[PDB]
Amino acid sequence: APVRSLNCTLRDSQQKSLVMSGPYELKALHLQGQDMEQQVVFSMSFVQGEESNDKIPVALGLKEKNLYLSCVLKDDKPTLQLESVDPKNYPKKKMEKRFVFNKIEINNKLEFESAQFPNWYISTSQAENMPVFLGGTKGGQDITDFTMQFVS
């Protein structure tokens, strides 16, 4: 059948919101009140891939944009990019592996691991107005945990 998707926002565990930073980048900053309309709304698709109780393969598209978070090697490093696709063909159930994140439940938060690059995670910096990036540490310094808000 079709692929199933939910509209949502994400916030890092320090409660920073995600906004656009030019056409192909996201940044995280502390946001409240009027400025909260600036936050990115995702379409989270539930895609084909290896699955367990607490590990669910998803794609993260931007709502009503032909843009997806993807994980590629850039200058020889695993790298988070926003990638354009053909809007006739997306979303789909069998998303290409660079688009797939393993959603994980851990102590009432979420981590998003790259399916392509094991133990690389969607990450934010402690500092305000810095890029969202792919980090090879779910350890300490950079933030790898999130809450989800379900949007109408």
CB of 21 to ligand K0G, least distance (A): 23
**Sequential DSSP letters for 50-111:** --BTTEEEEEEEETTSSEEEEEEEETTEEEEEEEE--TTT-S-SS--GGGEEEEEEETTEEE
Nearer to ligand K0G, 8 or 62 (CB): 8
Nearest to 122 by CA among 130, 108, 111, 131: 111
Nearer to ligand K0G, 46 or 83 (CB): 46
DSSP 3-state assignment of 33? helix
CB of 58 to ligand K0G, least distance (A): 8
CB of 86 to ligand K0G, least distance (A): 26
CB of 43 to ligand K0G, least distance (A): 12
Q: ω before 87 within 30° of 0 (cis)?
A: no
Gap between the Cα atoms of 104 and 102, Å rounded: 6
Gap between the Cα atoms of 95 and 62, Å rounded: 15
Nearer to ligand K0G, 13 or 66 (CB): 13
Nearer to ligand K0G, 59 or 110 (CB): 110
Nearer to ligand K0G, 57 or 135 (CB): 57
Which residues in this chain contact ligand K0G in the complex, by CB under 6 A?
A: 105, 108-110, 147-148
Contact 5, 17 (CB under 8 A): no
CB of 54 to ligand K0G, least distance (A): 9
